Paper text:
In this study we report the enzymatic characterization and the atomic structure of NopAA, which is the first high resolution structure of a rhizobial T3E. The N-terminal end of NopAA contains Type III secretion signals and the C-terminal domain of NopAA has been classified in glycoside hydrolase family 12 (GH12) of the CAZY database. Obtained results showed that NopAA has a xyloglucanase activity that may play a role in cell wall disruption facilitating effector translocation. NopAA as all T3Es possesses a secretion region at its N-terminus.
We obtained unique crystals of the truncated effector NopAAΔ48 from Sinorhizobium fredii USDA257 in complex with cellobiose, diffracting to 2.2 Å resolution. Crystals contain 53% of solvent and four molecules (molecule A, B, C, D) per asymmetric unit covering the entire NopAAΔ48 chain (except molecule B). NopAAΔ48 adopts a β-jelly roll fold typical of enzymes of family GH1224 with a large substrate binding cleft, containing substrate binding subsites running across the surface of the enzyme. In NopAA, these conserved residues are Glu117 (nucleophile) and Glu216 (acid/base residue). The electron density shows sugar units in the positive subsites of the molecules D and A of the asymmetric unit: two glucose moieties of the product cellobiose in molecule D (subsites +1 and +2) and one moiety (subsite +1) in molecule A could be refined in the crystal structure with an occupancy of 0.3. The cellobiose binds to subsites +1 and +2 making few interactions with the enzyme, which is consistent with the fact that cellobiose is the leaving group of the reaction and probably has low affinity for the enzyme. In molecules A and D, the glucose moiety bound in the +1 subsite interacts through its O3 and O4 hydroxyl groups with OE1 and OE2 of Glu216 (the acid/base catalytic residue). In molecule B which is not in complex with cellobiose, the residues 141–146 of the long β9/β10 loop are not defined in the electron density map whereas in molecules D and A, this region is stabilized by the interaction with cellobiose. The β9/β10 loop, close to positive subsites is very dynamic in the free enzyme and probably prevents crystallization of NopAAΔ48 in the absence of cellobiose. NopAA possesses a specific insertion loop between β9 and β10 longer (25 residues, from 125 to 154) than the equivalent loops in the other xyloglucanases (10 amino-acid residues in XEG, and 4 residues in BlXG12).
Numbering used by the authors: 15 to 236
The structure:
């Protein structure tokens, strides 16, 4: 209702009690974007990005872990959000290891489809003739939900593993510890040191301005 912090500046940031918020917007001609924080668990962002190729922004909240996967007893997160209908975007968890050589994404609600097609697509090495990203694993039930798994590389060669929920949702709880354990079991990485747990929206297009409310977001690390 009343903000404890707000910014419309690209890369404006604020931190309170272990949580930080980042107004990340880059690129040739970024559109206006304003993030507001009402408290440690509740925040919002409005963004007006043009109907052009590529991700323009990732407004997000972040929480630091800094622990090896093996030392972790509990790593879960709860989200509750209100999203617009149109545009090109994906609301996602962004989980990094401390070295930033492995990125794990969990897409909870998005404008594309779980099979890798749509106006947004997961990072992927391979695409189908229709242009849909090709999943490496399908209908995987892990960490409290069913997902489609995709594999790709970022521009600096770092590995990206993306899980797209087969059923989109605007509220839920993810068991990140178990998801990372399953990814380790397929051999993508070893006893990774978990660095950051992030949550926000990657906006490709939101012409006319679109609003995203994160009414609750919390991380439980033990
Ligand atoms: O290929 C498009 C991709 O660009 C990356 O930077 C993003 O993190 C992915 O989530 C996105 O789908």
């Amino acid at each position: 209702g009343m903000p404890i912090w707000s910014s419309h500046a690209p890369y404006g940031s604020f931190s309170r009690d272990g949580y930080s918020w980042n107004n990340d917007v880059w690129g040739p001609r970024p559109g206006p974007q304003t993030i507001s924080v009402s408290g440690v668990n509740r925040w919002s962002v409005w963004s007006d990005q043009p109907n052009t190729p590529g991700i323009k922004s990732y407004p997000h909240v972040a929480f630091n872990i800094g622990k090896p996967l093996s030392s972790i007893n509990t790593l879960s997160s709860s989200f509750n959000q209100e999203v617009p209908t149109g545009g090109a975007w994906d609301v996602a968890y962004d989980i990094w290891d401390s070295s930033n050589k492995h990125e794990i994404m969990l897409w909870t609600n998005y404008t594309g489809n779980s099979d890798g097609s749509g106006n947004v697509k997961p990072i992927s090495y391979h695409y189908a003739p229709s242009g849909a990203a090709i999943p490496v694993y399908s209908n995987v039930n892990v960490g409290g939900a069913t997902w489609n798994v995709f594999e790709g590389e970022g521009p600096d060669g770092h590995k990206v593993i993306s899980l797209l929920r087969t059923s989109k949702t605007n509220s839920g709880t993810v068991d990140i510890k178990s998801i990372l354990q399953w990814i380790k079991s397929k051999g993508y990485f070893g006893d990774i040191e978990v660095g950051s747990v992030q949550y926000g929206v990657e906006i490709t297009s939101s012409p006319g301005g679109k609003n995203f409310n994160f009414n609750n977001w919390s991380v439980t690390s033990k």
